[PDB]
Amino acid sequence: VLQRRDWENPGVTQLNRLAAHPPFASWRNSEEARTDRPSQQLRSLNGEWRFAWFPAPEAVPESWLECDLPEADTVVVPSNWQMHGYDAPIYTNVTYPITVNPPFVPTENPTGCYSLTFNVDESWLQEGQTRIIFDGVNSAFHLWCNGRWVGYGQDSRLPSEFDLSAFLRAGENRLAVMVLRWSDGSYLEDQDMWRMSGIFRDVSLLHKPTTQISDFHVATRFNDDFSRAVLEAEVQMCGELRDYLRVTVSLWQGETQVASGTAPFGGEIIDERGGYADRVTLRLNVENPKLWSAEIPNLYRAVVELHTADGTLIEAEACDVGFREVRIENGLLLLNGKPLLIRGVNRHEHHPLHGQVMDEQTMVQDILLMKQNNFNAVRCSHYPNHPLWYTLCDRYGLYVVDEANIETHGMVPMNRLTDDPRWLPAMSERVTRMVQRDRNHPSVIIWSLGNESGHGANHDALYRWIKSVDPSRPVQYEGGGADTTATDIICPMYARVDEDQPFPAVPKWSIKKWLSLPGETRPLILCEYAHAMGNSLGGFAKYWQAFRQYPRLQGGFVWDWVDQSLIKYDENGNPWSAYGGDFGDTPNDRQFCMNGLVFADRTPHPALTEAKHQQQFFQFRLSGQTIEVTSEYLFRHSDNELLHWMVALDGKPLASGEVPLDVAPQGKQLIELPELPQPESAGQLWLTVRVVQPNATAWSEAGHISAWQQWRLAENLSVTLPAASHAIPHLTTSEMDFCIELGNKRWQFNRQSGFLSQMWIGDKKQLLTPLRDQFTRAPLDNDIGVTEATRIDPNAWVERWKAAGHYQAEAALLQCTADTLADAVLITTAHAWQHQGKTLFISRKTYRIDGSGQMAITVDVEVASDTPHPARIGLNCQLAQVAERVNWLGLGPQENYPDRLTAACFDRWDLPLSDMYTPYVFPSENGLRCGTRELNYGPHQWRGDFQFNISRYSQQQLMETSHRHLLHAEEGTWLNIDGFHMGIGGDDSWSPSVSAEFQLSAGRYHYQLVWCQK
């Protein structure tokens, strides 16, 4: 066993492991099978096991086989032993966490010894078969029962089952499991995620009778209009064949039995030697089947009864059946004859406290949030999931891409193993045993051959295997250029909408271009797009405009759902979010483990609302007073929807109403708005519509908003000249300052710096740091990319800004004058920002302080055309006051940026100061709000047309601090007011991704602000 290193042999992936099959429970009562109640024949060993850690399997004491080690501790199972602290979890993206020397792994190979002492009743051993099921063991294990070696298993993400019948005794038994962290299986498990280990999914014991249902497959086929279906059920048995044996497959809609078939064993002739005597195929007619989709997840219950002709039950198995057809026709992916639009997300199995152990609550939380945010699909990135996931997807309604546990990203080249026939056996089992397990789940609509393993001949073989075995689902795979002979769907990752990326051998064409390449006919659905790392999803709207305009652009899966951050604790025992390198793990890929739409605790990032808005199922158009509503449902009518509409003048409500929605799938409804009264006062009328769900569903609460849109209506421009003031501001001059006085107010301009350095209301300072131009931002993850101090990526935005001296450019004064006017004082300034003799930016300003106390600031900036376009053009200052609330007229309520503001609505928003900061785990520029006409904070009011963020954290602190938990609130409030701000990008996070129309390239910029007190 130590002799024979099976964990270093890709030719050995298991020993004595039983055949894979769909979920079993071996009910002995038909009614219990029908209702899906617990089964007495299926026991959970999810309790406290004994555990001990060793640096290598050579260090495991032989005594551990027969007896418990006193050194061992008592730990919860399922678990990852890294989450218990026995050794460290490693975060690496591409580079393998071990030396690349297949089939070999390190001699120092962390070994987890699990054991359990448990009871078996005599009744389980008198007759029949007792098997143990390990749903998940990472990454390879040897199993012993009562001292005796049972078997061995690889593949971390599929159940391993072993017959214990001959090993057990009635009463006290002991299981011993030696789990190896590293194996030859690790070479095929190089997914971009925390590398962990252990018995991390359910362990169970299953009792089956000797004469048993050993396998069953459910197929549903349809006539052209889906008014007729045949359910075909192939059922296999093990045990001794007998003439009196029968199978009954019955189909149920709730408590109504809809169809039933009974036959003895003995299939039709197959070839010259006969048929399968151990198999039967039952076929049931179903008239006007209720069809399954993510829109309406209609399910039936199939009960599979093995019994005698006279009617004694032997055992029953069961599954949920969803009637649906998935096919590709004329280059379109069809579900029930209708072209899908995939509103998808990739989802890793990750919990911040429990690692890679999944639980029902977290699973359900995820589904609810997904459906609540207009997602209809999920990709199992990048392995078969916990078996309950598929059940939940079946029941709530989500389309699933089921993906084999094969990723060889770190090989050179990427297909070095997948093109090697010696690795085909190992690969084949990871595909075959997934299909055998999951093939009865209606939620699974597409099979995937794995991820980032290049394109090798093994892919082509395994592609064809699934096509033979299961014609009911398309097979996709992205490796080796996303349009190879091993995929039914063009499935690129991070291909852009309009921009080609012509990498040699594996180009990523513009998705619109890819579709029409000579000879290309297939549908395109991105397996990964819109990399949601930190402040991201810039340009998301561009994808959806394209998905909606192009039939064959059928959507994609966002990368990804949830940040893979883990909880650590400080000296005060306070929790914080950790990423790569925070466990002494090295090499690592730092914050790249965090790419989620939600935080690890399932709190949303601002990007989620942008995804919800773009993935809406109702589209809107306005013509005069008529709203046109178009449904993008393919199957359901809008029978739990009403349209609320509201017209407001600069945030002030003027009229509202509601109209029920009554839209056929793909249909249109016209809504004529009543005559709206004219406003007296100036300003812009805005129309906002919202789709509300009056009733609760299985996935949402009463009053849930599923869609919205906004339009500008009439605008009445202000022509009224403000009331003339009788006071006139007084200018006081010193060598160091221009001071302006008006009533209880004072303004101070430093003549050496050229900036407003202080402001007084009554006697009190308003500024802690003078008002100064700013052209930089604390860099986003998209700005940073894959650059490092030891290995600069000169193409990354941050590195371009640094090398050009944007971050260390010092303001030099060119002009500072003061003129007294009739009813105002005018300060005129000019500055140059230079780096090593090169003039980067020029800023020319006037400040006009009139008798009404208002300060008008006009700013005109020049940006050298050959310097990298700047992150922002605006001002910043540190205010002295900390106020409770922030009130603004502009886009909100949530964080929004120029290329991620479609979700935001224009209105009057009022939030606590803390909501104006986004707690990204890796800190950066954040909390900006665009299209803002008025900002209110304490006694201050700023007016104009600007973008702003406001918080207790300076841009400097944000860029200097690598974790949110190390941030400290600074004195006062940092205000950044921008005339212009660069896009955030996110098409990917390892190359510049900000689109040209969102780069600040205009050369000359102008903005104006009015600063006053209310």
Ligand X SMILES: CC(C)S[C@@H]1O[C@H](CO)[C@H](O)[C@H](O)[C@H]1O
Binding site membership for Mg(2+): which residues?
407, 409, 452, 588
Binding partner at 253 among Mg ion, Na ion, a copy of itself, none, C-beta below 5 to 8 Å by kind: none
Q: Return the half-sphere exposure (C-beta side, CA atoms, 13 A cut-off) of residue 476.
A: 28
Phi, psi of 622 (to 5 degrees): -120, 130
Binding-site size, ligand X (CB under 6 A) = 9
CB of residue 195 to Na ion, shortest distance in Å: 13
Is residue 493 near ligand X by the rule CB under 6 A? Answer: yes
Q: Which of 528, 641, 799, 925 is catalytic?
A: 528
Binding-site size, a copy of itself (CB under 8 A) = 30
Name the E strands within 322-419.
Answer: 326-329, 332-335, 338-339, 342-346, 377-379, 399-403
Phi, psi of 65 (to 5 degrees): -65, -45
Phi, psi of 807 (to 5 degrees): -80, -25
Choosing from 528, 610, 907, 987, the residue that interacts with ligand X (CB under 6 A) is: 528
By C-beta, is 161 or 781 nearer to Na ion? 781
| C-alpha closest to that of 236 among 209, 265, 207 | 265
Contacts (CB under 5 A) with Na ion, residues 19-58:
none
310 burial class (0-12, 13-18, 19+ CB within 10 angstroms)? Answer: exposed
Binding partner at 553 among a copy of itself, Na ion, ligand X, none, C-beta below 5 to 8 Å by kind: Na ion
Whether 255 contacts 267, CB under 8 Å = no
98 Cβ contact list (under 8 Å, min separation 6) = 105, 106, 182, 186
By C-beta, is 784 or 930 nearer to Na ion? 784
CB of residue 769 to Na ion, shortest distance in Å: 20
| C-alpha closest to that of 117 among 183, 47, 23, 60 | 47
Which residues belong to the annotated binding site? 93, 192, 407, 409, 452, 528-531, 588, 592, 595, 990
CA distance 785 to 765: 41
Choosing from 154, 535, 577, 595, the residue that interacts with ligand X (CB under 6 A) is: 595
User: Helices marked H in 779-869 — which ranges?
Assistant: 781-784, 797-803
Is residue 192 near Mg ion by the rule CB under 5 A? Answer: yes
Is residue 814 near a copy of itself by the rule CB under 8 A? Answer: yes
Binding partner at 493 among Na ion, Mg ion, ligand X, none, C-beta below 5 to 8 Å by kind: ligand X
Is residue 93 near ligand X by the rule CB under 6 A? Answer: yes
Choosing from 595, 843, 896, 955, the residue that interacts with Na ion (CB under 5 A) is: 595
Is residue 87 near Mg ion by the rule CB under 5 A? Answer: no
Contacts (CB under 8 A) with a copy of itself, residues 908-967:
945
Dihedral sign of CA atoms 343, 346, 350, 352 in order: negative
CA distance 282 to 10: 39
Q: Which of 295, 403, 452, 478 is catalytic?
A: 452
CB of residue 595 to ligand X, shortest distance in Å: 5
Contacts (CB under 5 A) with Na ion, residues 142-201:
192
Choosing from 121, 359, 715, 960, the residue that interacts with a copy of itself (CB under 8 A) is: 715
CB of residue 531 to ligand X, shortest distance in Å: 6
Contacts (CB under 8 A) with a copy of itself, residues 674-693:
684
Is residue 9 near Mg ion by the rule CB under 5 A? Answer: yes
Binding partner at 668 among a copy of itself, Na ion, ligand X, none, C-beta below 5 to 8 Å by kind: none
Phi, psi of 699 (to 5 degrees): -115, -5
Tokens of 323: 């009637």
Is residue 1008 near a copy of itself by the rule CB under 8 A? Answer: yes
Contacts (CB under 8 A) with a copy of itself, residues 838-897:
839, 842, 860, 862, 864-866
Choosing from 170, 309, 714, 996, the residue that interacts with a copy of itself (CB under 8 A) is: 714
Is residue 18 near a copy of itself by the rule CB under 8 A? Answer: no
CB of residue 997 to ligand X, shortest distance in Å: 25
CA distance 587 to 410: 13
Is residue 1004 near a copy of itself by the rule CB under 8 A? Answer: yes
Contacts (CB under 5 A) with Na ion, residues 899-928:
923
CB of residue 859 to a copy of itself, shortest distance in Å: 11
What count of other Cβ atoms lies within 10 Å of the Cβ of residue 858? 14
Choosing from 44, 681, 733, 815, the residue that interacts with a copy of itself (CB under 8 A) is: 815
Q: Residue 452 catalytic?
A: yes
Q: Let me know how long the chain is.
A: 1014
CB of residue 992 to ligand X, shortest distance in Å: 13
| C-alpha closest to that of 530 among 557, 499, 500 | 557
Give 370-373's long-range contacts (Cβ < 8 A, gap of 24+).
Answer: 370/345, 370/398, 370/561, 371/396, 371/397, 371/398, 371/699, 371/700, 372/612, 372/699, 372/700, 372/704, 373/597, 373/608, 373/609, 373/611, 373/612, 373/615
Choosing from 7, 53, 396, 592, the residue that interacts with ligand X (CB under 6 A) is: 592
Q: List, as one string, the DSSP characters of 72-113.
A: -EEEESS--TTTTTSS--EEESSS-SS-S-TT---SS--EEE
Whether 993 contacts 782, CB under 8 Å = yes
Binding partner at 923 among Na ion, Mg ion, ligand X, none, C-beta below 5 to 8 Å by kind: Na ion
By C-beta, is 93 or 936 nearer to ligand X? 93
Name the E strands within 294-421.
Answer: 300-308, 313-321, 326-329, 332-335, 338-339, 342-346, 377-379, 399-403
CB of residue 943 to Mg ion, shortest distance in Å: 49
| DSSP 8-state class, residue 65 | H
Choosing from 215, 349, 452, 582, the residue that interacts with Mg ion (CB under 5 A) is: 452
Which residues belong to the annotated binding site for substrate? 93, 192, 452, 528-531, 595, 990
User: Facing residues of 189 across strands?
Assistant: 407
By C-beta, is 142 or 459 nearer to ligand X? 459
Choosing from 133, 406, 532, 553, the residue that interacts with Na ion (CB under 5 A) is: 553
Residues making contact with a copy of itself (CB under 8 A)? 684, 712-717, 719, 721, 812, 814-815, 817, 819, 821-822, 826, 830, 832, 839, 842, 860, 862, 864-866, 945, 1004, 1006, 1008
Residues marked as catalytic: 452, 528
Residues making contact with Na ion (CB under 5 A)? 192, 547, 553, 592, 595, 923
